[PDB]
Amino acid sequence: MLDAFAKVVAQADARGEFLTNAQFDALSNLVKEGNKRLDAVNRITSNASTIVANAARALFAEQPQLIQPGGNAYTNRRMAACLRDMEIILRYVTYAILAGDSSVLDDRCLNGLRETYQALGTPGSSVAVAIQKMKDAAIAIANDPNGITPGDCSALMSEIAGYFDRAAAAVA
Amino acid sequence: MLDAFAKVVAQADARGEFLTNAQFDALSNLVKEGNKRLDAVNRITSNASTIVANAARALFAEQPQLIQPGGNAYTNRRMAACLRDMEIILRYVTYAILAGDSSVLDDRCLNGLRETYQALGTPGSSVAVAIQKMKDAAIAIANDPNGITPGDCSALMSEIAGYFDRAAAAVA
Amino acid sequence: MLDAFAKVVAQADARGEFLTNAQFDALSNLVKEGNKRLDAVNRITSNASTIVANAARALFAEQPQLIQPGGNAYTNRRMAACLRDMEIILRYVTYAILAGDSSVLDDRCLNGLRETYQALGTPGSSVAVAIQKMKDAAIAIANDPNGITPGDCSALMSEIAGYFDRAAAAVA
Amino acid sequence: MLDAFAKVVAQADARGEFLTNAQFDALSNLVKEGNKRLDAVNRITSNASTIVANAARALFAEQPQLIQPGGNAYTNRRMAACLRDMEIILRYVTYAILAGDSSVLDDRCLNGLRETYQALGTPGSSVAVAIQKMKDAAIAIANDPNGITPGDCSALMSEIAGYFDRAAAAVA
Amino acid sequence: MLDAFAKVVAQADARGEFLTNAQFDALSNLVKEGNKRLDAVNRITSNASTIVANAARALFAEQPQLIQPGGNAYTNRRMAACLRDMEIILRYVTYAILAGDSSVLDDRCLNGLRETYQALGTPGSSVAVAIQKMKDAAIAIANDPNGITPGDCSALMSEIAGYFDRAAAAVA
Amino acid sequence: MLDAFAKVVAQADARGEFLTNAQFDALSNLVKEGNKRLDAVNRITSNASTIVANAARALFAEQPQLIQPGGNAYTNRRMAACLRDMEIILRYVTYAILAGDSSVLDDRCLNGLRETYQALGTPGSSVAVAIQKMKDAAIAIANDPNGITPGDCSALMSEIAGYFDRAAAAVA
Amino acid sequence: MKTPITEAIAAADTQGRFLSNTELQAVDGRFKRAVASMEAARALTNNAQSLIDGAAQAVYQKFPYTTTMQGSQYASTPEGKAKCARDIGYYLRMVTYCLVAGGTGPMDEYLIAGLSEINSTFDLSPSWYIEALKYIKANHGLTGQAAVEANAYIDYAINALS
Amino acid sequence: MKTPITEAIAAADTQGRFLSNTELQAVDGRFKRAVASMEAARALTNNAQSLIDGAAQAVYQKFPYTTTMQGSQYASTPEGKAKCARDIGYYLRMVTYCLVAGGTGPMDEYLIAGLSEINSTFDLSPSWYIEALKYIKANHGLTGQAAVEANAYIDYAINALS
Amino acid sequence: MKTPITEAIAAADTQGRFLSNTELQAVDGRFKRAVASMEAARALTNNAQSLIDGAAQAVYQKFPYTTTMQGSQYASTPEGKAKCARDIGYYLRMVTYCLVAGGTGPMDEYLIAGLSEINSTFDLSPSWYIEALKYIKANHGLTGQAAVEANAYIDYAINALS
Amino acid sequence: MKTPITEAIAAADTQGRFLSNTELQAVDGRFKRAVASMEAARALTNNAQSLIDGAAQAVYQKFPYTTTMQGSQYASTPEGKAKCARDIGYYLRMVTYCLVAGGTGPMDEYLIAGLSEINSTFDLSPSWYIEALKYIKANHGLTGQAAVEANAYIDYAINALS
Amino acid sequence: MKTPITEAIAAADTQGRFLSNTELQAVDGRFKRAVASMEAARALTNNAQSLIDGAAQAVYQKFPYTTTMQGSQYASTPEGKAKCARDIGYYLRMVTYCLVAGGTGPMDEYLIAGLSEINSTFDLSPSWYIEALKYIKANHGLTGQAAVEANAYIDYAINALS
Amino acid sequence: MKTPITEAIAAADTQGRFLSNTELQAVDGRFKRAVASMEAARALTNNAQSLIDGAAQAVYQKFPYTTTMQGSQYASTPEGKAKCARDIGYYLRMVTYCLVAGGTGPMDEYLIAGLSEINSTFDLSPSWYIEALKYIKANHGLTGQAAVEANAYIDYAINALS
Ligand SMILES: CCC1=C(C)/C(=C/C2=NC(=C\c3[nH]c(/C=C4\NC(=O)[C@H](C)[C@H]4CC)c(C)c3CCC(=O)O)/C(CCC(=O)O)=C2C)NC1=O
Ligand code: NA
């Protein structure tokens, strides 16, 4: 896996060049915003149980068919697997944030997930909606202005929103 | 795997219903015929070695090409594998009888057998004929009227014949 | 795996025949030329390090793009893998010579190599050229007339050349 | 492992004798009391969670030092292991009852348990007391006269009491 | 493992010396007697089944207690293990002969055999006697004067007898 | 494994107490000296190859018998194992420094090392001397006053010297 | 799914054997016991609604806070009370399933697997469902071996909740 | 050793479970079948000597060469005929063992394990022992489920020899 | 036990490497953060008794049935209320342990391991301990990164209970 | 298939090495021995029919019951006697195969693999084929190392049958 | 690729955990150290050509035979001297890569993996590259923690060459 | 230790077989080759000192810097030149060992194992020892298959150094 710093090195190596001044100054801005990145990871991770549970409640409240007899979170074995999937999807979104790159989300989580749900018979549309609900919950908690040194974090939230969309798209 | 009793439960659960009176009375008839089922399993299993051997003798007596140099039960390694296959096919037919359901025959034995013989270069037509000969041998022994409390067992033999046909069809 | 002697047995068995006089006399000529076969294996194997290195030097000297940043023997990990591949390809060519049959070269080395390089992104054209350079190096050393009992070995070199071509063709 | 029926066969074989009339009549009495044996196993197993929990409560209520900081069921990891041990000890006592022989209790559970607790630093005296409390709980539930066809089961309770004592002795 | 040639190298290396003339001339005599060594291995190995069987027959004919009910080759599982042991002991004696050194017999077979039989409860005295009977059978067959180029092989038989005694001593 | 901070927690838990003011102030001094600790680890680790090599040169220069034919770093296999041991011993001394506790040195490296060398036949006296030479080399490099912010580091060197002595004692 | 017939088949198949008389005895005991199992199953199925309404109340009696306290996990709303009765209905339905199939297989597969994962996530107290299953045990109104059967699978649930 | 009670215990223990009603049903079927198994066992034990003398002759009838041909593996000496009767006696004794223990465990452990290893080494034809066991099957003189029991374990031996 | 220093050592040791600059950076961040961690730890330790008495009541407020209902698992006796305060005291003590050792290691080893096994056996509702830890979070009276530290380990407990 | 050349290649390949002088010596010994192996092979091939007719009779002599006794496994019919000669022919053909390929590989692959499985199923006595191979051994009429070669592979078959 | 951020992620992911405060501390130390790492990286990048020309000569000074001796592996031709400077350039470029990515990952992946395989095949003396990297260490002209950073990764290379 | 006799034994033992004619052929080829191997071994042993003095100089000729340059790894002191001759002596002694034992086993065990670990640590150039072994190859003064033998093991060393 890579991060924001390891990707630029890899792309620079493929050309066989030293880093330019416009690449050092870009990566130096990455470090300065590092504090904002750590708070966002800390805040979201600190409310993991709730973001998963609340998103699941709303999902099954909107699509009762999922938990009806026969349908794909009926029985505790399938319900638990669903709660686990949601928890896992969230776990790898937080991994991506800290690194500032989706390589770990792509390689470990997303790639070969759509094909899994198809073989199982799991609505990928329903999964993506569960991801989207976790997104709104995660963003609001992360960018909650109470009890932190005030400052703009608009760019960082789009990046966070990027990873959540990316997972939804991957199984939609 | 399932049996006659576990399949009805599974299909009832998928709808999320309690069992009806027409489902209890149907399963109660299953239990009453249980004695006939155990004799058929006991009798066939008690003559396993003979049913396999006698069926093999007739098979190679009808298709000498199978045991000719080059052809697919020439050499003891291929002949033994053939005798083993026949023995295995029989083993899982008897499993199905006791349970009153072909799920174990399907899941463990049949599924992915035709594709095996194609890669190996084994006549699936010859395999099915060996199965059919074991069928006639197995039925006659099972429904042999000497030395048992007399009673009709016509339905049970069709079921037994069903599993044997099913294996023949699966590789024919 | 087979050799010159095990292949003729296999083909004879498939027909179910004893060996003819024209098959014993053919295999007896195989044994008489056995001395020439052992020298060729001994000579080539005794200069393994050089044949690989010298062929690699010329290859990268003709195709500098291979060792340029980005391109497929840049970095020591890819360069080492390349030197290893060349060494492995050579190892199995020498195996084939001693046996007088390419079954071990085919089964163990060649089969499923082209498909490997395609997934990796390795020029199969460049690999075959590296094989061809090892061929010329291997032949000249094997048929070097200094310091050995003089005698014709023209047939044996074509056979050796056959295995080298065979590997080039397999990945070209 | 053995049972009441397999042990007599083993001891008979070692002498190389057929069973006597005094051995068939003894084993026939075993079968007649089989109903009482199945109820005792069913009743004890049906209250597994309670017998373990209630015995643990009393144990730690009598020996508070066990759950004090430093001491051997402080922290949930050691407390859970203790609850597990008690549950396991009980599991193999019920195995022994159904079979009418302690071979499975001896081979699988007891042998090499005392030596385990010594290396860990676990009071074997405290373990045996926990076993003894489960004994009294298990016996009272098993021989509870409410809601069962009345009849003497005095002999069977001594046998059950034998296995419980046996485990206490093994770690005392 | 070592052989006659690898042991002398090992002992020479430990002193850090080249081989003397009295060590080359000694090893050269080893090679000249090599033909006699190969016949002895070939002859004994060619009658493996008989030497084991005939030795077993005589053993149980002299010690009937071994095959009596309770006693250590009663039942086919223990009888087979015994026949296997005898076969294995013989297998490693023939290994030692070809090499001219007992290192493989010692390392792989003998070492930790006496301690095995003690834990099992197998008479080591009876095992050694079975070894001794195989010795006499093996020697007579190996040194049988019919159908071979006449010549003295007295020294070689003592060496063969050495390995057989060695195994008897190891478990006696 | 533990460190300076995890050991105090463990000992506090065993009594079931919160940390005192004399324990916070002690651990706070640990953090303030943290800079000196990181330099010592960095400096020693930056000269790993040299400290091992130079210590080995002196060792074999003082005890030539070790590298004589027969004796325990003769042959490259034993010499390499020796160089590896020295390298490993050093690796775990540096682990201990960073943590400020020898638990990882004890558990992973030292415990069951003396007993290893005895079975192998390796002079434990010679090993300890090799450790001692690495100590003097490691200390001088770590406490080298050129090119670093001046300040006392006497206490830290005794601690470092403690781990080196500890390893020598463990195999002496 | 775990039944005596599937166990008997699994026992033989693991060791690559045809079925022996060992396994055939087991299945006879199963068919022999079916008599009492079918009786307990049909009896609970007939009196199912009364048992679910009875059990649900026994919960609200013992734990009155579940009907007062605010929160989705509680039976303090028409939604909550619907979810409660549904869940109780599930437990009873699984108990009949085990009697018909003569083993724990149904309750193991459809209910117990991942049970502690659900209760933990959705804040459902295990003791609520014990008290529910305790009422069913006392008031199913069965006798003889029919009662022995029903209770065996009821207590198997209770043990899974404890 | 393989019995329904040991299988039931092995089934539960492998999965780390207490015994369930699934396993308890199996053992009931075992105790229920014991009636016919004990009858077949005691009946063969009583008429043991007559069956061994009868079976031994049926072998010598069908294969007369076994009493004429020279060699230790044949019944052409007082030693050979003693070994023959002994071996036949063993087979019958194992059949009673299986009836008492209600499973194949005894015959599996004491007889079948390494059976083909012995017959191969000592040149004992399997068909000799089939013919022996065939006589016992036809002439044990049992009826009802007692005969069903005896023959089940007799044919299990025959299958092991074929 | 899990700490940044033990992780850094574990990371290197698994791959048979000496420590690199990669690992040394991690430990600096640990020593750099200790400032705020030591502050949060000593502050909670000083105001420990008031927090335990405060949290215990917040539980009894939210769940009044725990002080009324009969049973050993409830705080309806002098024994129960002693057990309650003790348990709350344990949680807080573990939170300080994590701040001193700069990682989750202490709470993981002494508390979380086998947590769901205890609560299930002894009928202790997870939500009771959430409400306890919720009070500590709101009323520890810390500011800046000291509050960020304390709450990080408090929420890690809450997540383990949910 | 097992030969000295395939073993030499297998030996090196398992350890990822090029061939050394160790392996080259082995193959020389193979080519050196071929002289006597080719002689034994061609000699048996030439006198093949006479050996098969001779061996087949030696069987019927020693075991006269095989020509009298009724049953498909016996040589008491034109079919049986055809099957007998065929089988004997196979054994001899495999012995020549081993001499040509200078190892046991052919007989191992085409004959020995699953040998005891066939003889057991089809009721073929191993001793019949020993007596067949015993006749070939005594009457092949070879001398010197040619006889040493032939007999080595003949006895290897006999050992596989015992 | 090995970095503190990838290690922190790898540490958590292996144990199936979300990230804890343990891992977050590590990454802060990384961002905190970046200041000095970025300074060392940009400084070497700016003075890159002078360092490569300087280091290359220091090699030819210490080992004069490399410019005289005939052979492709030596710097005794315009080709050789071009290959030398290129290789030295690679080493320096990897050192900056490690400073930017705050770990050994780049040099490990692009350089060290299979390093001893290349030097052995192409007859390149390790000591040549030590002497090259020794010159860079002494003459990079950095101060404070910037020099501590640069040298840490330079010595990591030297250790890989020894 | 690797020899044709140990390989032949290892080949059989891995597959649990007695030795076959396959393995016996290999050992004959070994005994057949010994003639030329013993000749090469005794010839090098006799002219050992002259070869070591000759080879050592050929190194100092080709690489004159090894006698001038300061450092313990070089032959620029009486100690260094003693270490050089000793090492060369070792190589030659191992070559004779392989001829006596008819395989690579000795040189593999006593020399090659951990070879690259020593040369890397003690800064010994592989090419020095190639040039040493190159002189021995050209000037051992052997003819026929004796020269074929000697050179086979000499080149096996050279390949291990490249
Ligand atoms: C699913 C497994 C299974 C069970 C559970 C089972 C129970 C069982 N035990 C029975 C009787 C009985 N059970 C007991 C046992 C006891 N009575 C006492 O006073 C003691 C407190 C207690 C000792 C545990 C007695 C005394 C009888 C009557 C005598 C007998 O039939 O053996 C009967 C016969 C019918 C009856 O009389 O009620 C059955 C079916 N059978 C089975 O196949
Ligand atoms: Na038992």
Residue numbers in the entry:
A (entry chain B), B (entry chain B), C (entry chain B), D (entry chain B), E (entry chain B), F (entry chain B): 1 to 172
G (entry chain A), H (entry chain A), I (entry chain A), J (entry chain A), K (entry chain A), L (entry chain A): 1 to 162
What does the paper say about this structure?
In addition to the standard model system, i.e. proteins such as hen egg-white lysozyme and proteinase K from Tritirachium album limber, we included phycocyanin from Thermosynechococcus elongatus, human insulin and the SH3 domain of α-spectrin (α-spectrin-SH3) from Gallus gallus.
